[PDB]
Amino acid sequence: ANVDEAILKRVKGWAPYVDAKLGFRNHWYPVMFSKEINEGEPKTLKLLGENLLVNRIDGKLYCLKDRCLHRGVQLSVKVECKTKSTITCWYHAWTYRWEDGVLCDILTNPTSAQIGRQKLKTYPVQEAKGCVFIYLGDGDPPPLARDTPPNFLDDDMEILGKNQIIKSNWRLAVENGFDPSHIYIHKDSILVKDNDLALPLGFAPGGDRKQQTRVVDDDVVGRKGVYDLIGEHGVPVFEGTIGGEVVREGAYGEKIVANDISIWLPGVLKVNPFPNPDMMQFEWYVPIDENTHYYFQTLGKPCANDEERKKYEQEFESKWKPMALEGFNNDDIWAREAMVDFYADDKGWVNEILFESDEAIVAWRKLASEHNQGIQTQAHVSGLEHHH
Amino acid sequence: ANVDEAILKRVKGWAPYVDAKLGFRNHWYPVMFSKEINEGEPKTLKLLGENLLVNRIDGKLYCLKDRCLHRGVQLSVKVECKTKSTITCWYHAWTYRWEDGVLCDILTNPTSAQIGRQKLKTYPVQEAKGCVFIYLGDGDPPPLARDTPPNFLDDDMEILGKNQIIKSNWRLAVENGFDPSHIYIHKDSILVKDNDLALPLGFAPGGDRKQQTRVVDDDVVGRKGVYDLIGEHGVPVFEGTIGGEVVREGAYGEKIVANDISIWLPGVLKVNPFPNPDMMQFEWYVPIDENTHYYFQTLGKPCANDEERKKYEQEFESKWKPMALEGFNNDDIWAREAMVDFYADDKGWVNEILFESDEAIVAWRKLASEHNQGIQTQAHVSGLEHHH
Amino acid sequence: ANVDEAILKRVKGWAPYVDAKLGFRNHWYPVMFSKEINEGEPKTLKLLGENLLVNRIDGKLYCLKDRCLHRGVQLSVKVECKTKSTITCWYHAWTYRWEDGVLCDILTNPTSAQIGRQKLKTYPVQEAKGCVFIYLGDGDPPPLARDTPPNFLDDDMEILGKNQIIKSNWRLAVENGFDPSHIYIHKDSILVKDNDLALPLGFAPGGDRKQQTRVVDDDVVGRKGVYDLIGEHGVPVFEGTIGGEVVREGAYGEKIVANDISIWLPGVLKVNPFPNPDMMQFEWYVPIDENTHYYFQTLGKPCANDEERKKYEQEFESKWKPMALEGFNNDDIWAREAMVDFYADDKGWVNEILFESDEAIVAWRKLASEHNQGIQTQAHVSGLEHHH
Amino acid sequence: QIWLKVCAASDMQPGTIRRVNRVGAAPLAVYRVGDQFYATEDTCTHGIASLSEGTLDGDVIECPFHGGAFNVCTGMPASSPCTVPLGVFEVEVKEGEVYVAGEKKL
Amino acid sequence: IWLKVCAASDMQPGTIRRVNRVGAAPLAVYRVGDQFYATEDTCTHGIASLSEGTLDGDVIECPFHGGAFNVCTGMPASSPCTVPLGVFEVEVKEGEVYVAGEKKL
Amino acid sequence: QIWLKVCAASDMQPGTIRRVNRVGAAPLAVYRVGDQFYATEDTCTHGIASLSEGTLDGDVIECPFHGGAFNVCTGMPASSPCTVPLGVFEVEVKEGEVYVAGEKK
Ligand SMILES: Oc1cccc(-c2ccccc2)c1O
Ligand SMILES: Oc1cccc(-c2ccccc2)c1O
Ligand SMILES: Oc1cccc(-c2ccccc2)c1O
Ligand code: FES
Ligand code: FES
Ligand code: FES
Ligand code: FES
Ligand code: FES
Ligand code: FES
Ligand SMILES: [Fe+2]
Ligand SMILES: [Fe+2]
Ligand SMILES: [Fe+2]
């Protein structure tokens, strides 16, 4: 729907994934932190190309499409919440209920036949671990757990994070994150020295193709993803050579991190342990539009009580966020941006020349192609089209 | 010409209107005030996508297309008017008469066979009521009155106003103008408090469809337009309610305004009386290109002598212009802008969900579709294309 | 390839030239001066839409495509030259030899089967006369002399110049430079007064069409070009008249310049003598992308020894660069920019109205169409496309 | 009233539509598909158009404003941009007179 | 007043012949079936030679921009051409094509 | 050593491809094109794709990753984005047994 069909016909292994420029419909996605959305203070965001309004009413989150049914303006140009349970479009005062989107009043015409006979699109919203998830999909949502990596929802796991808008397509973000060899770009990160990490420059793979990954499609909660097992039969590279001469070394610190790396639908990476041996990193790359994504970074650490939580929160603000979320992952941001031009015309999906560590990326591409719950199209954005 | 044919096939009631993204050719349009164009100082503007030059010579206005026949540069990059009656292209000195556009000399080659054989496009220009009108069309023009609202050209009617460039398509400005329910956006206008207006929030319509408007296709001077009669059988809303509770009231001032509202081809609204019981508002939404229009506002007040006119001008400056042309109509500007995205891909013309007061808008769309004098196309802009 | 086929069908005289929006492949082009690139300091540029890297190793220039084979990033985002003879991609450490582009190492996987089996595109580079030329082409280059005007490469000829980026398509630059009647735009240049040039307003052609130009299809060095002979039988126009009245005079100075003017593939103008009787100007219009070119300006003067060269250098900096390269050619820059709109939709190539002095331009378009060595296409930029 | 006399069945050709105006209520549309008769609300549910000014193609009515369409038997949308089903009204022929219900089904 | 062009047999149907005139602008002579027509050679839209164009029935297509004229009436038949061509009288007399040195009206 | 015995001719249906693994060396692909056999390197020259997981169309193998392709007789690219020729291995069928050369060309 989204890409030149001549290109889709070439990429037989993963055409759905190449077509999913706007992301995958019918999944849960995080879009902000709980503390960023206050009672009666509606917030605008764009997710999978759709303009949405979120509001908190009696503490509960509600999500409406930020587009009046009448003449297609954003309600948010001038929000008019006149009662606690409704929003009134500023234009002709069509009035909608937060709770089901039903057009329940029209101030400019109380006798109008449209009253009670139209419904503004609503989306399910759920807060978990201080994060706001929207189900950008149709009908009854599945459990959140389906679209979260293992352990993110564990009872004791305290989650802190950061979110920002990055100018690349979401798929470039996913591939960069799950790419075993991209670790090269991190060799001079302030975290490697200042947190005493062991960090190789890359990996010489071993064994066969099937052993490079573990495809998970039998998890009881229905989650779908891929573990990167390059390090199980591979020799890590600590001495980088040109013409047999050593020109760069890896890092020989004591702390072992990133024993398991997995990517999960709809596009969330889990690195464990990271950035410290007692912590985990979970990061989402959430499609906003064809050119941009939320980089939704979270760090998880088991905390057993409120004293530990506060201690973690203080370590996060003073150490982990500046040293790891920024000091390590800032290089990922500009890496992602550097691939935009090659893939922007969709030709990079044909012309890329892969090597052996990209087996992990290929496994993800095929997983995502087979198990996604639907392809978002520009028609979902503008209004679905069908001729009898 | 201008829109995907699949969309035009869907909008059976008003396809020519939907196709008329660049506006209607073969009508008169106001583009500036007489006092903005001085003897022998050519001015540039863009009208219906076309770059034009206007000059005053011996007090009379002349209009040439601002595009040299030779290599298609704008003459206005470096204006060389070397004799009273001519303009010389700055590039290779092709020289054109203001009066008929004839290529009368070429300074770089006075023996050229092109001399006397080519003609630059000219358009008729007429000044009336201190306003400069250009007939953006072919052949001898109709009378200006055909393309003006009733009373605008009245001998005693004194016209003052304001012009500026607005970032929306012209049709969004027209529809917003003529839309009876859009009065809602004006409910907190300073004009309402500070000039003591009666102003409802909207209208509960009554009567049949035919009774909601009066279509004028039988005016003696050839004017074609629609009167909005919603308030003839309608109950005006002064108490807006949600779930039966009053949430908003209209304005209960003394002064009665906007008794008759009419829209006229090519796109000029007349509001009578407004913004005071003894005045009228006439405003044009003039197509510049697909994305922009002139919002050309005028206020009329009958005046008998220079005493009345001067007093009108002082009041215009101190009260009507700031309080009405700006303080009231500024909200119309961003309302227009807010519709851009829905209609930008032409899908808004299919997906809009109309209600009862939109019957006025529909009447205008049909009138405009049936009685416009031609659809401007990109080929008009670039140069007409045909094999006979 | 590059233009609507309905337009190429109409321009039967010169369809390949009209199609050559991105320039001609398989020619040499100057891109910078030798002094602008120092030992071991790689420099980025874009030429015929291709991002390139140029490095100086042991005095000699090498040119690699600035696009990693693997994921299509620009190497120049973060240059890593880890050995004298190599460059290492910053992303996954693919390493390439400057000399032949071979992928000789991958630091992140030294056992990769890709090593020694892939080649980054290289282009030949040659320095001549202080200028850096790149052969933007495939296979063994022809001699540089093929793509330079006569005398530019003479042993004694001292070349100084200036380079900048201009916002027009390269062809608009070429045509403006070679256009006999464009001299009108220079009528007020400081050079004309301050170097006492004779400069007509234009020329009334004499003799037949065939005598207006001399096409060279040479097969000793293989150069291809056209001389403008309008002044051989033409009458110089020193007074410009409108309706028989004199409105403008040419410049009646003593110094006669621009005896011969010729344009050569791939798009380099020679004006001899200029801007003084003892000197010549050679200027290239080098395609960067569809909208942009290098205006690569050079002044040549035969010099026998070191103190002649030194003196020439001082006169260039104090006089010829500011009075001629800027004071004269600055008007050429904005003239070229004024033609962009008309040719931007490719419709100017059909709608232009040519006159007699445009025979030179027509001879160039035909020469260029017949004798170019290939049309650069957007597929050369992204990667050549072919289906069995 | 419960059953509203429309017309004689012979006063409608196959493939035609008749509008039925009602005091105090919104208009209905009656459709003849072959020898059978169906009825819906006359106002398109996507807007303010009259479906009786549309085009019938078998048992699908096409709205004249935006090209949305409905199945006249079921009232279900058949073409975008229509999404809200029409009210369906029972039609009966008794002594060759067409009657339409005054209240919609369900 | 009359210029001798060629034998009628010298020109095939659907062909064009340039007529150079000393001291004057060139003409084009067109054979449409067995009839002959003459116009100015120079395209009114620029400086093209119409004799280098393509004849399709009674319509000459200009080689520069694809403008076209009816060769009998000299009226433009395709864009971008807008200015009519000068038409010149042709007579065949005794197996010989002749063109009027002057344009008609 | 040189010739390697791959399989019974009959073990391959027409239009199918078989991967031949080789200790200490890159896998080969054996193609059955009607009743004829051909052999190349298995690894696409453009990437890491297995040509044995692609699509045979006559004597042209289409890579499953990017739709590049090769003539399996000559090893030359038939479709972009492949530009580097495949190593070709000589094949002989003797007594319904498929043998592939030890080394290229
Ligand atoms: O996206 C990511 C976020 C955080 C850490 C890693 C990582 C992976 C392997 C080794 C070291 C760090 C990563 O890829
Ligand atoms: O475009 C416009 C300009 C000025 C006034 C009105 C108006 C219309 C109805 C009621 C009150 C004012 C308007 O629509
Ligand atoms: O821009 C230019 C580039 C090269 C030559 C001239 C030139 C031509 C004729 C006479 C004098 C100068 C020019 O204008
Ligand atoms: S656009 Fe929202 S009520 Fe009209
Ligand atoms: S572009 Fe105006 S005279 Fe040449
Ligand atoms: S993009 Fe250059 S090595 Fe991966
Ligand atoms: S009103 Fe019927 S389709 Fe829109
Ligand atoms: S010169 Fe003949 S069509 Fe332009
Ligand atoms: S890996 Fe075979 S075509 Fe790219
Ligand atoms: Fe990373
Ligand atoms: Fe308004
Ligand atoms: Fe110049």
Automatic annotation (TrEMBL), chains A, B, C:
Q: Which InterPro entries match?
A: Cholesterol_7-desaturase, Homotrim_ring_OHase_catalytic, Rieske_2Fe-2S, Rieske_2Fe-2S_sf
Q: Which residues bind Mg(2+) 2?
A: 196, 252
Which keywords does the record carry?
2Fe-2S, Iron, Iron-sulfur, Metal-binding, Oxidoreductase
> Where on this chain does Fe(2+) bind?
182, 186, 332
Give start and end of each Rieske domain. Answer: 28-134
Where Mg(2+) 3 binds, per the record, is at 252
Q: Which residues does the annotation say bind Mg(2+) 1? A: 99
Residues annotated for [2Fe-2S] cluster binding in this entry:
68, 70-71, 89, 92, 94
Q: Which Pfam families match?
A: Aromatic_hydrox, Rieske
Determine if Cell wall biogenesis/degradation is one of this entry's keywords.
no
Q: Does the keyword Iron apply?
A: yes
Locate the residues binding Fe(3+). 182, 186, 332
Q: Mind telling me which CDD domains this protein's record contains?
A: RHO_alpha_C_DMO-like, Rieske_RO_Alpha_OMO_CARDO
Q: Which GO terms describe its molecular function?
A: 2 iron, 2 sulfur cluster binding; metal ion binding; oxidoreductase activity
Identification of the protein by name: Terminal oxygenase component of carbazole
Q: Source species, please?
A: Janthinobacterium sp. (strain J3)
UniProt lists the gene as carAa
